[PDB]
Design a protein around this ligand. Structure first.
Ligand SMILES: *[C@@H]1O[C@H](CO[C@@H]2O[C@@H](C)[C@@H](O[C@@H]3O[C@H](CO)[C@H](O)[C@H](O)[C@H]3O[C@@H]3O[C@@H](C)[C@@H](O)[C@@H](O)[C@@H]3O)[C@@H](O)[C@@H]2O)[C@@H](O[C@@H]2O[C@H](CO)[C@@H](O[C@@H]3O[C@H](CO)[C@@H](O)[C@H](O)[C@@H]3O)[C@H](O)[C@H]2NC(C)=O)[C@H](O)[C@H]1NC(C)=O
Ligand SMILES: *[C@@H]1O[C@H](CO)[C@@H](O[C@@H]2O[C@H](CO)[C@@H](O[C@@H]3O[C@H](CO[C@H]4O[C@H](CO)[C@@H](O)[C@H](O)[C@@H]4O)[C@@H](O)[C@H](O[C@H]4O[C@H](CO)[C@@H](O)[C@H](O)[C@@H]4O)[C@@H]3O)[C@H](O)[C@H]2NC(C)=O)[C@H](O)[C@H]1NC(C)=O
Ligand SMILES: *[C@@H]1O[C@H](CO)[C@@H](O[C@@H]2O[C@H](CO)[C@@H](O[C@@H]3O[C@H](CO[C@H]4O[C@H](CO)[C@@H](O)[C@H](O)[C@@H]4O)[C@@H](O)[C@H](O[C@H]4O[C@H](CO)[C@@H](O)[C@H](O)[C@@H]4O)[C@@H]3O)[C@H](O)[C@H]2NC(C)=O)[C@H](O)[C@H]1NC(C)=O
Ligand SMILES: *[C@@H]1O[C@H](CO)[C@@H](O[C@@H]2O[C@H](CO)[C@@H](O[C@@H]3O[C@H](CO[C@H]4O[C@H](CO)[C@@H](O)[C@H](O)[C@@H]4O)[C@@H](O)[C@H](O[C@H]4O[C@H](CO)[C@@H](O)[C@H](O)[C@@H]4O)[C@@H]3O)[C@H](O)[C@H]2NC(C)=O)[C@H](O)[C@H]1NC(C)=O
Ligand SMILES: *[C@@H]1O[C@H](CO)[C@@H](O[C@@H]2O[C@H](CO)[C@@H](O[C@@H]3O[C@H](CO)[C@@H](O)[C@H](O)[C@@H]3O)[C@H](O)[C@H]2NC(C)=O)[C@H](O[C@@H]2O[C@@H](C)[C@@H](O)[C@@H](O)[C@@H]2O)[C@H]1NC(C)=O
Ligand SMILES: *[C@@H]1O[C@H](CO)[C@@H](O[C@@H]2O[C@H](CO)[C@@H](O[C@@H]3O[C@H](CO)[C@@H](O)[C@H](O)[C@@H]3O)[C@H](O)[C@H]2NC(C)=O)[C@H](O)[C@H]1NC(C)=O
Ligand SMILES: *[C@@H]1O[C@H](CO)[C@@H](O[C@@H]2O[C@H](CO)[C@@H](O[C@@H]3O[C@H](CO)[C@@H](O)[C@H](O)[C@@H]3O)[C@H](O)[C@H]2NC(C)=O)[C@H](O)[C@H]1NC(C)=O
Ligand SMILES: *[C@@H]1O[C@H](CO)[C@@H](O[C@@H]2O[C@H](CO)[C@@H](O[C@@H]3O[C@H](CO)[C@@H](O)[C@H](O)[C@@H]3O)[C@H](O)[C@H]2NC(C)=O)[C@H](O)[C@H]1NC(C)=O
Ligand SMILES: *[C@@H]1O[C@H](CO)[C@@H](O)[C@H](O)[C@H]1NC(C)=O
Ligand SMILES: *[C@@H]1O[C@H](CO)[C@@H](O)[C@H](O)[C@H]1NC(C)=O
Ligand SMILES: *[C@@H]1O[C@H](CO)[C@@H](O)[C@H](O)[C@H]1NC(C)=O
Lengths: 135, 322, 216
């Protein structure tokens, strides 16, 4: 099958900025320029149709996002263990989500950790109970 | 599923005719997106339950208890335990449906991340018991942790301090037996295989439905267009669109029902993980048969496996009571 | 107080109820908007079909419109049934939480909030409930050397309830969830067999509280 696939726009809150990234699902970055025909408004669409900041993910090809070797908590789920955020000059970056912070318990066969204080923690849990009874 | 491409194959006339039916394609796309988001959320709740990524000590001396069959094996390319690797191998073409606008999408969390989460949970429970499941992780020897768990089920801790060797030997023997049973039994993972087969069969039926004439002269849009004039091609394409839309609606309804069932199953699995792996549950027959002691989580393709370790009386003697 | 802020500062705190309402509104809007589709007919207005066309073909036009509208209604009703089943499951979960978390203390882990659950408070909201879970969480932890048992006169002593800890030289017995060291005595410890089988036993002296009274 020639190619085909979906096109998605990754954009943060409009209050933050307006720049966006374009993801073409399950397609190599080589065919992206011809996959959209480049017959659009001269800036913007052509800018997001190609450029230096092009990343090849298992979920597809991403354009308009800067690949960073760092790992942060997932903000915008891209897929295949990869996410995107707006962290920086602020721009759009793509990274691999980190499954929390590393830890190592000092386990020993003759040592036990006992609490010396305490805290009263109050948390909220919201649950729907019903809906509108439309007729 | 691409509703437009699926119903109409690169046919401008077919797309124009379908445009008069409303916005069913948008409804189906929204339903599929919601199903995918629900699957991702279910996976997150089931697995993403611990923040810190705990790691086992370099030296594994737990008073004789052996956890090799459940701890990750760095020797293999994938950092997964022997049981996890066996589960992955024992479960087994979907990409062969990428011909009629049927995308498969990527899972949000890779198998590596799920394995890492399982290993972190195992390390936390082994090195900290249930303390890490309620707040700051507190270290404790495994012997004392098992003594606590025995006390939880109404048995004095002296029994463990007197038969630690026997208990460790029994635990290792049971781990070996369960590993052997999983290896030698191909029906142990029936649920996941059945779910995969159901999904594959549904997709196969959906794609095969495109070959039905639905009362039209032919099942190929191009053939109808070439062999008939617009006045009759209109009605033929309309009938084909109606049939394909009905098939798509049926498939989407079935997918929604299956997604609801899987969401219920995932909620149950998350509850079991919270109440058994992270602590001792007094509920009868919830975290396995017998007096529940503890549980070990493992990851399988689109599923979880709980190894419930429980205390069971073995030999009884008659006595006179007052 | 923080809870109030947690609702005022965060706009998406009530995401579930708002999402449910938005989904219902979108479904209703799509259902009402579906009436504007021709469904293959010349027009989507019954009056237009009746006036323009004679009964002969007006019959088939009305049949097509009826089929389309009926299909839309069936799809909407199926979606509503699925959503109602989901909401019934959610309501059952909420009722179970209210019965267990609010009307009593639940030992289930992570069921009524995070940590050692203490008490739940219910609150209402448009088509939803909010449970405020107050729980006990350890804050500061200190690590001490520990032993599984203690031998005094050739007999292994195990704590009645708690754990043996050592602040270096001395030894004490303290409760598991709080550091309250106490002098080891026969009242808070019990004997079970000799002290040549337990692995890791540590020698120490168990203070008998009877001796001071006997001496005096
Ligand atoms: C526990 O008991 C049950 C119940 O049956 C038993 O039958 C006999 C053995 C009884 O023996 C008494 O034991 C008491 C202490 O445990 C008591 O202190 C006495 O020592 C003894 O009775 C006294 O002494 C004898 C010598 C005599 O003088 C009596 O007059 C005295 O009072 C007692 O344990 C108990 O009732 C066992 O399960 C089975 O229960 C059956 C009845 O429900 C009993 O009868 C039949 O046995 C035949 C044998 O072929 C079976 O085919 C049949 O189905 C039925 O079972 C069984 O004998 C008995 N045992 C078995 C193996 O079926 C149980 O085995 C026993 N032990 C344990 C570990 O539970
Ligand atoms: C905790 O548990 C683990 C796993 O159960 C132990 O690690 C080893 O586990 C295997 C299980 O039998 C054993 O080691 C393996 O023995 C295989 C043959 O069995 C004999 O081999 C040894 C050495 O020759 C004999 O002395 C002994 O009598 C065994 O009966 C070997 O073939 C294995 O080598 C490689 O090939 C096999 C082929 O099937 C693989 O399956 C293996 O994984 C391996 O890649 C292997 O040597 C033995 O019981 C355990 N120890 C060792 C050193 O192997 C841990 O020892 C145990 N305790 C801990 C971890 O503290
Ligand atoms: C509570 O229940 C537990 C078990 O659930 C009991 O512990 C078991 O006791 C039996 C009998 O004492 C043990 O079985 C015996 O083990 C002997 C030790 O052999 C070692 O090597 C073999 C090699 O295969 C291992 O399988 C075995 O576990 C040992 O590591 C064997 O030698 C015995 O076989 C022969 O024993 C005598 C000689 O001593 C012969 O005369 C016999 O004919 C027989 O052929 C026998 O197999 C069993 O191993 C124990 N369990 C465990 C986990 O070790 C407790 O005793 C019981 N307690 C009470 C109070 O009832
Ligand atoms: C591990 O934990 C143990 C137990 O707490 C520590 O040992 C004790 O440490 C405390 C504080 O350092 C000591 O407290 C002392 O008390 C003296 C009076 O106690 C009388 O009785 C003891 C026997 O139990 C006699 O040895 C002593 O001479 C007294 O007759 C005080 O005189 C000491 O100085 C000041 O404190 C007291 C507090 O009331 C004042 O009233 C005095 O007037 C004086 O100004 C001191 O406070 C205690 O004696 C130690 N032993 C015991 C058995 O409790 C270890 O130090 C600790 N180790 C580590 C590494 O942390
Ligand atoms: C009580 O627990 C503390 C920490 O929880 C122990 O101190 C040491 O803290 C380290 C903090 O992470 C632990 O990890 C270390 O991290 C550093 C990097 O920051 C590494 O370079 C180092 O190799 C460790 O991995 C460490 O495990 C922990 N214990 C150590 C270092 O021994 C504390 O230990 C006490 O202090 C140290 C300095 C030694 O003197 C210990 O003998 C001593 O017990 C723990 N104490 C007890 C009694 O359990
Ligand atoms: C266990 O933790 C509690 C708090 O979680 C400790 O009590 C708190 O201790 C801090 C530090 O002393 C107090 O802060 C102080 O407040 C005064 C004003 O009252 C201020 O002048 C100081 O500069 C300092 O900020 C705090 O008020 C106090 N209470 C609370 C509710 O936080 C307690 O001491 C801990 N116990 C042990 C044994 O460590
Ligand atoms: C916890 O782990 C420590 C090690 O991290 C264990 O310490 C070990 O204890 C054994 C038994 O006391 C020592 O065996 C040695 O045997 C020789 C010959 O019989 C004897 O002369 C020594 O005095 C000693 O007993 C072993 O050397 C020792 N290891 C280390 C590194 O010190 C400890 O037993 C474990 N269990 C507990 C409850 O602490
Ligand atoms: C805790 O206390 C007990 C008793 O007070 C200690 O037991 C003692 O163990 C030593 C050996 O480790 C014994 O020494 C040898 O005993 C044998 C058999 O009695 C004897 O034939 C030898 O000539 C030698 O004396 C000792 O007798 C035994 N009892 C006493 C009172 O010392 C135990 O060692 C202590 N544990 C620790 C960790 O210190
Ligand atoms: C964004 O700014 C506008 C106006 O300032 C307003 O909508 C709001 O304050 C901000 N947030 C959103 C979601 O619009
Ligand atoms: C297309 O991308 C895949 C990775 O998904 C890579 O293996 C392959 O070599 C690429 N092909 C071309 C022509 O770039
Ligand atoms: C990331 O790491 C690779 C090595 O695998 C390196 O080639 C690349 O330059 C690094 N990029 C950044 C932004 O650090």
């Amino acid at each position: 099958p020639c190619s085909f696939g979906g096109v998605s726009v990754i954009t943060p809150g409009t209050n933050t900025s307006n720049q966006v990234a374009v993801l073409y699902q399950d397609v190599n970055c080589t065919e992206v320029p011809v996959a959209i025909h480049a017959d659009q408004l001269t800036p913007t669409w052509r800018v997001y149709s190609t450029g230096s900041n092009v990343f090849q993910t298992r979920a597809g090809c991403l354009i308009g996002a800067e690949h960073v070797n760092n790992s942060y908590e997932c903000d915008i789920p891209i897929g295949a263990g990869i996410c995107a955020s707006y962290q920086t000059s602020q721009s759009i970056i793509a990274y691999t989500m980190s499954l929390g912070a590393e830890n190592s318990v000092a386990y020993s066969n003759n040592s036990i950790a006992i609490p010396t204080n305490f805290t009263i923690s109050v948390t909220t849990e919201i649950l729907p109970v019903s809906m509108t009874k439309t007729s | 599923v691409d509703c437009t491409m699926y119903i109409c194959g690169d046919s401008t006339e077919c797309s124009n005719l379908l445009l008069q039916y409303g916005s069913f394609c948008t409804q189906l796309n929204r339903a599929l997106t919601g199903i995918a988001v629900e699957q991702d959320k279910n996976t997150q709740e089931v697995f993403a339950q611990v923040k810190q990524i705990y790691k086992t000590p370099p030296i594994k001396d737990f008073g004789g208890f052996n956890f090799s069959q459940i701890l990750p094996d760095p020797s293999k390319p994938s950092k997964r335990s022997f049981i996890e690797d066996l589960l992955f191998n024992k479960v087994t073409l979907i990409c062969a449906q990428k011909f009629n606008g049927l995308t498969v999408l990527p899972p949000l969390l890779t198998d590596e991340m799920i394995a890492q989460y399982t290993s972190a949970l195992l390390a936390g429970t082994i090195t900290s018991g249930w303390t890490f499941g309620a707040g700051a992780a507190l270290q404790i020897p495994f012997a004392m942790q098992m003594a606590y768990r025995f006390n939880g089920i109404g048995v004095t801790q002296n029994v463990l301090y007197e038969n630690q060797k026997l208990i460790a030997n029994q635990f290792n023997s049971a781990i070996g037996k369960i590993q052997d049973s999983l290896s030698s039994t191909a029906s142990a993972l029936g649920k996941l295989q059945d779910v995969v087969n159901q999904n594959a069969q549904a997709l196969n039926t959906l794609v095969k439905q495109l070959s039905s004439n639905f009362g039209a002269i032919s099942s190929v849009l191009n053939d109808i267009l070439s062999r008939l004039d617009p006045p009759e091609a209109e009605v033929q394409i309309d009938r084909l669109i109606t049939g394909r839309l009905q098939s798509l609606q049926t498939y989407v309804t079935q997918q929604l029902i299956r997604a609801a069932e899987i969401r219920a199953s995932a909620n149950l699995a998350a509850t079991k993980m919270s109440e058994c792996v992270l602590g001792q549950s007094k509920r009868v027959d919830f975290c396995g048969k017998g007096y529940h002691l503890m549980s070990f989580p493992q990851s399988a393709p689109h599923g979880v496996v709980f190894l419930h370790v429980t205390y069971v009386p073995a030999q009884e003697k008659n006595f006179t009571t007052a | 107080g923080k809870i109030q802020d947690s609702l005022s500062s965060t706009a998406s705190a009530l995401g579930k109820l708002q999402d449910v309402v938005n989904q219902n509104a979108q479904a209703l809007n799509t259902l009402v908007k579906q009436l504007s589709s021709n469904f293959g007919a010349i027009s989507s207005v019954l009056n237009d079909i009746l006036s323009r066309l004679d009964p002969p073909e007006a019959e088939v036009q009305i049949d097509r419109l009826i089929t389309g509208r009926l299909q839309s209604l069936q799809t909407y009703v199926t979606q509503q049934l699925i959503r109602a089943a989901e909401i019934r499951a959610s309501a059952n979960l909420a009722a179970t939480k209210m019965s267990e978390c609010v009307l009593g203390q639940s030992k289930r882990v992570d069921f009524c909030g995070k940590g050692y659950h203490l008490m739940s408070f219910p609150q209402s909201a448009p088509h939803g409930v909010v449970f405020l879970h107050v729980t006990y969480v350890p804050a500061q932890e200190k690590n001490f050397t520990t032993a599984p048992a203690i031998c005094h006169d050739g007999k292994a002593h195990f704590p009645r309830e708690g754990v043996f800890v050592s602040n270096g030289t001395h030894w004490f017995v303290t409760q598991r969830n709080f550091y309250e060291p106490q002098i080891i005595t026969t009242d808070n410890t019990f004997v079970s067999g000799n002290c040549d089988v337990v692995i890791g036993i540590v020698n120490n002296t168990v203070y008998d509280p009877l001796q001071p009274e006997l001496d005096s």
